[PDB]
Structure formats: C-alpha cells, structure tokens
Amino acid sequence: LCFTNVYADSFVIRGDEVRQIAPGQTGNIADYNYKLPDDFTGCVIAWNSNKLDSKVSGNYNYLYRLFRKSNLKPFERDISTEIYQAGNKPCNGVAGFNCYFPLRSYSFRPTYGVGHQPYRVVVLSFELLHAPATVCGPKKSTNLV
Amino acid sequence: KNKCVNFNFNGLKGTGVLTESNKKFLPFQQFGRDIADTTDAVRDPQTLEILDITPCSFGGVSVITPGTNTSNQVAVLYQGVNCTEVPTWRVYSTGSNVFQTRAGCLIGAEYVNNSYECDIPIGAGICASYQTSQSIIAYTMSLGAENSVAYSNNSIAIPTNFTISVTTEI
Amino acid sequence: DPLSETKCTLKSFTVEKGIYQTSNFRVQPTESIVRFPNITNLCPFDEVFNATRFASVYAWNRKRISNCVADYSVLYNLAPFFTFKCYGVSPTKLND
Amino acid sequence: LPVSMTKTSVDCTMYICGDSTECSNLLLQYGSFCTQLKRALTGIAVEQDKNTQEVFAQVKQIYKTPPIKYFGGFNFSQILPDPSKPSKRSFIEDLLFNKVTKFKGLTVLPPLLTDEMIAQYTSALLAGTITSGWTFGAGAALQIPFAMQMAYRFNGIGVTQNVLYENQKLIANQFNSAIGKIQDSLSSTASALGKLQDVVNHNAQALNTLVKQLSSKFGAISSVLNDIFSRLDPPEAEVQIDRLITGRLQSLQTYVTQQLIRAAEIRASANLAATKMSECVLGQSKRVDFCGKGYHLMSFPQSAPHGVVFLH
Amino acid sequence: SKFGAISSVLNDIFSRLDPPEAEVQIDRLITGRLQSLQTYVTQQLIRAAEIRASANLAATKMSECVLGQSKRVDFCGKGYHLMSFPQSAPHGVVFLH
Amino acid sequence: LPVSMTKTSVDCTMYICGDSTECSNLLLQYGSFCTQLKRALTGIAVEQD
Numbered sequence: 044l045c046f047t048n049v050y051a052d053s054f055v056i057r058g059d060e061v062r063q064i065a066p067g068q069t070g071n072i073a074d075y076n077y078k079l080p081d082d083f084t085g086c087v088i089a090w091n092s093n094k095l096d097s098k099v100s101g102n103y104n105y106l107y108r109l110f111r112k113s114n115l116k117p118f119e120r121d122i123s124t125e126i127y128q129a130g131n132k133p134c135n136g137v138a139g140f141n142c143y144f145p146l147r148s149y150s151f152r153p154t155y156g157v158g159h160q161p162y163r164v165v166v167l168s169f170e171l172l173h174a175p176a177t178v179c180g181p182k183k184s185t186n187l188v
Numbered sequence: 189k190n191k192c193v194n195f196n197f198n199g200l201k202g203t204g205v206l207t208e209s210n211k212k213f214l215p216f217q218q219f220g221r222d223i224a225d226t227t228d229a230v231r232d233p234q235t236l237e238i239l240d241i242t243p244c245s246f247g248g249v250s251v252i253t254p255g256t257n258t259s260n261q262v263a264v265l266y267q268g269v270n271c272t273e274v275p276t277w278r279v280y281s282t283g284s285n286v287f288q289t290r291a292g293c294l295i296g297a298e299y300v301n302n303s304y305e306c307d308i309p310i311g312a313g314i315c316a317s318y319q320t321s322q323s324i325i326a327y328t329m330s331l332g333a334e335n336s337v338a339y340s341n342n343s344i345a346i347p348t349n350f351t352i353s354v355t356t357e358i
Numbered sequence: 359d360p361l362s363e364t365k366c367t368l369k370s371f372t373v374e375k376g377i378y379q380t381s382n383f384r385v386q387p388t389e390s391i392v393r394f395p396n397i398t399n400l401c402p403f404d405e406v407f408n409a410t411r412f413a414s415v416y417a418w419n420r421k422r423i424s425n426c427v428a429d430y431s432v433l434y435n436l437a438p439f440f441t442f443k444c445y446g447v448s449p450t451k452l453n454d
Numbered sequence: 455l456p457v458s459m460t461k462t463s464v465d466c467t468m469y470i471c472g473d474s475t476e477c478s479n480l481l482l483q484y485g486s487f488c489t490q491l492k493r494a495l496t497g498i499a500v501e502q503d504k505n506t507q508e509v510f511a512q513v514k515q516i517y518k519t520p521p522i523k524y525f526g527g528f529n530f531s532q533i534l535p536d537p538s539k540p541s542k543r544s545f546i547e548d549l550l551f552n553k554v555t556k557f558k559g560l561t562v563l564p565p566l567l568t569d570e571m572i573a574q575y576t577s578a579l580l581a582g583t584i585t586s587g588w589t590f591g592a593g594a595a596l597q598i599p600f601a602m603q604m605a606y607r608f609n610g611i612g613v614t615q616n617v618l619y620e621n622q623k624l625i626a627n628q629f630n631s632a633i634g635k636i637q638d639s640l641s642s643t644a645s646a647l648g649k650l651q652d653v654v655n656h657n658a659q660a661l662n663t664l665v666k667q668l669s670s671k672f673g674a675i676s677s678v679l680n681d682i683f684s685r686l687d688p689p690e691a692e693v694q695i696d697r698l699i700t701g702r703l704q705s706l707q708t709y710v711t712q713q714l715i716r717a718a719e720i721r722a723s724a725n726l727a728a729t730k731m732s733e734c735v736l737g738q739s740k741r742v743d744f745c746g747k748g749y750h751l752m753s754f755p756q757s758a759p760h761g762v763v764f765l766h
Numbered sequence: 767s768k769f770g771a772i773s774s775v776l777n778d779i780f781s782r783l784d785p786p787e788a789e790v791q792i793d794r795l796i797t798g799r800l801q802s803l804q805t806y807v808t809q810q811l812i813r814a815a816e817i818r819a820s821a822n823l824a825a826t827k828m829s830e831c832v833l834g835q836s837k838r839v840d841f842c843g844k845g846y847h848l849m850s851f852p853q854s855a856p857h858g859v860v861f862l863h
Numbered sequence: 864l865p866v867s868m869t870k871t872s873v874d875c876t877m878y879i880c881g882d883s884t885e886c887s888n889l890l891l892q893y894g895s896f897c898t899q900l901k902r903a904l905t906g907i908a909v910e911q912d
Binding site: 487592593711721 | 767769770801805809815816819837839840844845846
C-alpha cells in the first residue's frame with residue numbers, strides 16, 4: 044500500500060505505561076497527554092533505551108504532566124505551565140492551599156526494574172487514499188499494456 | 189414537567205415527558221417497563237414520586253404538490269397529529285390556510301364548499317385538486333351527477349335512437 | 359421548502375403529480391434532567407488500597423462497600439499503578 | 455367476499471432506533487434497506503384504494519328511490535337506507551357494522567373512501583336493481599315496472615309468464631319470510647361475518663408480533679440501544695448495536711413479505727367481488743354456483759367493513 | 767452501501783487487513799449482498815404471480831370476447847357485446863371492444 | 864387442473880439444533896421468530912383442506 048504522508052511523534056514513556064498506546068485506552072498519558080481515536084491508521088515503534096538514555100543520579104531532562112482539568116483532544120500539544128486549581132484559592136503561579144504543581148520528572152535509573160526502564164515510543168500516522176500518494180517501499184514498475 | 193428533554197435516571201437514558209402516575213405501585217419498586225422491553229415508570233430517589241414517561245417526536249410529513257412544469261405551490265399534510273399544539277418551514281403557522289380533517293390538518297390549501305371530481309387523494313373522504321391566481325383547493329369527492337326518475341305503476345321507456353361505442357381495455 | 363423535500367426522498371429532480379411521503383417530526387430536546395441520590399459521605403477506597411498488609415490468594419478479604427459516593431480520581435485522574443484491565447464497562451464511563 | 459385490508463405504514467427511524475444519535479449514524483451506512491420497505495408498503499396502500507373503486511362503484515351515475523313505495527306487494531325497507539337517521543344505513547347494515555370489531559413507528563393509515571360513501575354506492579346501485587332493471591349498467595337506465603322485471607328474469611331460466619302473474623300473492627309469503635331469516639341469523643351469531651373478522655385478526659396478529667421482536671436480544675447482551683452505548687467500549691458498541699439493526703431488519707423483511715402475500719390474496723378476492731357486482735347485481739347469469747345455488751333471479755349488495763355482503 | 771464494514775470494495779479489505787481480520791469484514795459484505803438478492807427473489811416472484819392472474823384474464827378474453835359472443839356485463843366492455851378486436855402491444859395486449 | 868399440495872411442517876428445535884443444551888439456550892434469545900414459522904405452515908395446511 045502507498046500513502047500520502049506520515050507524522051512521526053517521538054517521545055519517551057516509562058516502562059509500565061508503554062502498553063497503553065492503543066485506540067480507546069485510559070491512563071495518565073492515555074487521557075491527559077496522547078489519545079488515539081478509533082479511526083487511527085498507523086504503527087507503534089518501541090525500543091529499549093535503558094543502556095543509553097538512563098542516568099545513575101536520575102534523568103531530570105525529560106519531564107511530564109499528570110494534571111489537566113478535563114480530557115484532552117487528540118493530536119494536540121499542551122504547552123501551558125498554568126497551575127491546576129482544585130479549590131477557590133488562587134494559586135498565583137506558585138504552590139499553596141489547593142494548588143499542586145502539575146509537572147513531574149521521570150524516575151529513570153538503570154539499576155531498577157522493568158517499569159523504570161525508559162522506552163522510546165515512535166508512533167507513525169498513516170493517511171491512506173485521501174490524496175495522491177507518493178510514499179511506499181521499493182516496488183518496481185512495468186510498461187502499460 | 190411537560191417538556192421533551194433527555195433523561196439520565198440511575199444510569200438509564202431516555203427521552204420523553206413527565207406526567208403524574210395515578211396507578212398503585214409497590215413501595216419497594218425502583219422502575220417498571222412496557223409491552224416491549226421499554227420503560228414507563230421511574231422513581232426519584234431523593235424525594236419519592238413516580239412519574240410516567242411518554243415519548244416524543246411522533247407523526248409523519250406528507251406533501252401534496254402538482255408537477256414542476258405547472259406550479260411550485262405545495263400543500264403540506266400532517267399525518268395523525270392533533271394540530272392545536274402546532275419540517276423547516278415555519279411560514280404556514282400564521283394560520284387561515286388550515287382545515288381540520290380526520291386524517292390530520294391540511295395547511296397551504298383553501299377549503300371550498302363545492303363538490304367536484306379531483307385528482308390527488310388525501311384520505312377520510314377529503315380529496316384535493318389544483319384549480320383556479322391559481323392554488324390548491326380541498327373538498328369532498330363527488331359521487332357523480334344526480335338522476336331523479338319518477339316511477340309509477342304503468343310506465344315504460346323504449347329507446348328510439350342508437351349508437352355504436354368503441355371502448356379500449358389494456 | 360417542501361418542494362425541495364420531495365426531491366430529496368424520491369432522488370429525482372422532476373416531481374410528478376401526486377401525494378408523496380417525505381419524513382417524520384423531529385423535536386429536539388433542550389435541557390437534561392439528571393436525578394441521582396444525594397449522599398454526603400464518600401466511598402472508603404483509600405482504606406483498602408493504601409493498607410499495609412493484605413490477605414492471601416486462597417483466602418482473600420472481600421470488602422463490601424455500599425451507601426456512599428464513589429471517588430474514582432485515584433483510579434482515573436492518576437495512575438501510579440501497574441495493571442489496568444477493564445472488560446464489561448469502559449473505564450471512562452465509571453463515574454456515569 | 456372481502457374487498458380491502460387495513461393499510462399500514464412503518465417508520466424506519468422509530469422502530470429500528472430508540473432515537474439515539476449512534477443508531478442514526480450507523481443507519482446511513484446501511485442505506486436503502488428501509489427505503490424499499492417504505493416503498494413496498496406504499497404500493498400496497500395505492501392498491502387498497504383501487505379495490506374499493508372497482509367493486510363498490512360500477513357506474514358514475516347515482517340513482518335514488520322515490521318516496522312513495524309500493525313495489526310488487528313486497529317489503530323492501532330492510533335493504534333501503536333510513537332517511538330519519540343522519541347516517542345513511544339500512545336495517546341489515548346496522549347488524550353488519552356492529553359484529554366486526556400504536557406509536558413506536560407503527561401507524562394506522564385511514565382509508566380514502568369512507569363507510570358512509572360505501573352505503574351511498576350501495577343505495578344507488580340498489581336503486582337501479584329494484585326500479586331501473588338490468589339496463590342501468592349497460593347504458594342509460596330504462597323505466598321498467600317491477601311486475602315486468604321478474605317476468606323477464608324468469609325468462610332467462612326457462613320459465614314463462616304463467617307462473618308469476620297467477621301466484622304473485624303467494625310470492626310475498628315466500629320472499630318476505632326468507633329475507634326475515636337473514637336478519638335474524640346475522641343478529642344472533644357473528645360467525646357468518648367471521649371471514650371479515652379474520653382480515654382484522656390477520657392484521658392485528660401481524661402488528662402485535664412485530665413489536666414483540668424488540669424484547670428479544672438477537673444474540674446481543676442487551677436489547678436496549680442506550681445500554682450498549684453507556685456501558686461497552688466504542689469498538690465493542692459498533693458490534694453489538696449492529697447485531698440489533700441486522701436482527702430488527704430481518705423482522706421487518708418478514709413483515710413486508712407477509713403483507714404482499716396477503717395483498718395478492720385480497721386482489722383475487724376483490725376481482726371475484728368486482729366480477730359478481732358486474733354479473734350478478736348488474737345483470738342475469740345462467741351460471742351454476744356463482745350467483746348462488748340453483749337458478750339466478752337477482753342479487754342485492756350490502757355494505758360491510760373491509761368487504762361486501764351479497765344477498766342472493 | 768458499506769454494510770457495516772469499513773470499505774465496500776473487496777479489493778480494499780484484501781489489501782489492508784489481517785487474514786483473520788479480512789474474513790470478518792468480507793463476510794459482513796456477503797451477508798449484505800445475499801439479502802439484496804433475497805429481496806430480488808421475493809419481489810419479482812410476487813410480480814410474476816400478479817402477471818399470472820392478469821394473463822389468465824387475458825387468455826380468457828381472447829377465448830370469450832374475441833373468439834365468441836358473450837352475454838356478460840362489464841367483461842367484454844360496457845353495454846351489450848357484439849365483437850372484440852385484439853391488437854398487439856409490448857409486454858401486453860390492447861383490446862378494441 | 865391441480866388442486867392440493869403436500870402439507871409439511873418444520874420443527875424449530877430439530878432443524879436448527881442438534882439436540883444440544885447449548886443450542887437450545889441460545890435459541891431463546893431470538894424469541895418469537897419460531898412462533899411465526901409454525902403459524903405460517905399451519906395456515907397453509909388449513910387452506911389445503
């Protein structure tokens with residue numbers, strides 16, 4: 044099959060939640076970060092990065108968000124640094140009463156188990172027969188009869 | 189009460205109106221059903237009242253029109269619906285084009301008191317036709333002409349004149 | 359127009375002479391009535407989740423929890439957990 | 455002989471779907487399934503009005519009864535309608551009407567020709583049979599006296615005029631007592647009208663069995679369309695709703711097929727009824743066991759719900 | 767009509783889905799294409815039954831009205847019958863009474 | 864001229880199922896569909912007599 048274009052989204056998920064990339068899941072990443080609708084067409088690529096991207100003192104470079112007020116729409120990036128407000132107390136950009144900081148950091152060390160292993164999740168998105176399609180593998184061509 | 193709305197009652201969903209139930213029910217009863225596997229009675233858990241559920245959006249839309257080479261005027265037939273409570277066309281709700289029949293009400297057509305031979309039937313004795321500044325008229329379909337013949341003890345009629353008629357059956 | 363509603367059902371642009379069936383009435387709902395029982399108490403889920411010692415496989419602890427309002431926000435909004443497997447009910451629809 | 459049936463129409467939206475947005479979006483993938491089933495029930499309802507036109511009205515001309523009634527020393531008032539009532543009904547058809555006995559996307563179509571106008575077709579064609587003779591349907595109506603009708607209605611079966619004119623006082627004991635046994639039999643028992651009662655009962659058992667297919671689960675877990683969408687997964691709810699739409703359209707294909715077989719059985723009975731209005735009522739036949747048993751004299755039609763009652 | 771399947775083309779299901787997954791979706795299309803043929807067996811045979819009773823009425827009026835003299839009323843036409851003239855027609859017959 | 868035909872009757876349980884307990888429990892989910900088939904072959908057999 045030959046398709047038009049592809050959107051490759053490269054991100055790192057800790058090793059417990061890497062099974063959660065499917066249409067119709069529920070989780071931390073599967074609700075408030077990355078959703079797949081039921082009409083999605085593509086492939087999910089994973090690889091073991093624990094020999095490379097880990098660190099002895101912990102990986103503080105990659106960060107993630109556990110909090111959103113509602114369900115996020117899919118194929119959308121949330122860049123908002125705004126503090127989640129649970130009550131009627133205003134947060135004013137800092138933590139306080141009914142104010143929690145939404146952005147957390149990963150647990151990555153090589154000496155731990157399976158769920159602390161970093162995995163590199165690359166999800167291809169295929170758009171098939173919606174357009175003229177220039178992208179497929181090395182198929183040959185013959186003369187017209 | 190008395191509005192067509194969406195329902196969420198204890199996880200169950202539906203659409204209808206809420207009327208007062210006069211039937212004697214069990215005090216331990218959560219809900220009850222119908223002739224199918226469908227509902228009628230629910231129980232409000234906060235304050236105890238049992239209300240009937242009658243569903244909405246009933247009745248059909250029928251149109252009465254001539255051909256496109258004659259006129260674009262369309263009479264609209266409402267089907268089986270009581271018309272005292274009343275498609276995207278709201279212009280015929282002003283009134284005075286409405287005539288109440290047994291089958292429904294007909295809007296966009298003027299009722300006449302004469303009796304003719306029509307073309308497009310409606311139902312329940314009332315028919316319709318496009319006649320004469322021309323519009324759609326509605327009336328009761330005629331039985332034909334009236335013949336009153338006086339009969340007595342001794343009279344006879346003998347025909348003196350003949351014709352040859354040719355009829356075609358297919 | 360009901361002239362244009364004749365052509366949509368019959369799939370023809372030339373309307374002949376006669377009475378034609380078209381459609382049915384659609385009454386759109388406006389509001390929504392949601393009636394749930396009011397309980398001020400919450401479900402005791404943090405006692406059975408966060409406890410220090412649990413039971414065994416051959417004899418387990420079956421905890422019946424009733425007459426309260428369930429808090430799913432440790433299950434749904436957060437996941438510091440391991441296995442999520444749901445079968446009959448979708449896990450987003452548990453609060454409904 | 456029964457003539458017409460009960461005209462029905464089935465909505466595709468209300469019977470298949472529970473007015474949910476998921477069931478209406480999956481119905482458009484199925485397309486023209488209930489478009490043809492709406493069209494096939496439309497073509498039944500055109501032909502039910504054509505069965506009343508070929509039977510009840512033979513001619514377009516209306517004849518009426520003179521108010522001074524002496525016809526042959528007979529009592530004709532049981533088949534003639536009552537002018538004192540606001541409804542036009544005879545004495546026999548008062549007994550004939552009384553012995554013959556919702557939403558969810560079913561409906562009941564009303565008929566075109568009303569039962570008041572069937573009796574106006576009945577009293578017009580009884581006005582031509584009693585007074586005008588046999589010539590009202592073959593052309594313009596003559597004026598034939600009633601003593602001159604039955605002399606030539608005896609002439610077709612081989613009887614001359616010697617029998618009628620001598621015995622004419624003795625026929626009034628025979629004819630008026632025989633028609634009085636018809637009025638007493640139809641008032642006592644409803645079993646003679648039970649052929650017309652089955653036409654109500656075949657339509658009543660067809661509608662009541664069609665609404666009992668909703669409680670059957672059709673292989674799905676729940677038969678409620680709102681309970682699939684509020685519980686199961688959205689890949690799972692596309693399977694279980696489409697098992698119910700496949701199951702309810704097979705019950706709808708069963709219903710429209712059985713109405714077309716009963717439309718063909720009521721077409722051949724109405725063509726038998728339109729023949730006996732043209733032969734037995736509008737003329738004299740030499741046939742055996744068509745216009746009644748033995749020799750034919752004359753035939754009197756009467757109005758009936760969903761049919762016609764002949765008096766031979 | 768897509769019959770509940772994703773694509774209504776049999777070549778599109780064979781070029782995309784798994785061989786377990788293509789045998790579900792093609793069998794949804796064949797069951798939709800059987801029921802479209804079973805309405806064709808149903809509706810045309812009823813119209814074959816309605817054309818059987820009309821041709822038996824048409825073969826009666828050739829035997830009665832055309833080939834003989836009938837005394838019937840409103841069978842051979844309105845009024846007293848004399849003779850009848852058949853004429854040929856596409857998918858039918860035209861009588862001149 | 865032919866008059867009558869051969870009167871037949873089809874059972875619901877014996878043709879569909881192989882007299883197994885799993886097939887008879889799943890037959891009741893379809894409901895009244897076998898009620899219509901038994902009334903149809905009876906109404907042929909009344910009219911053949």
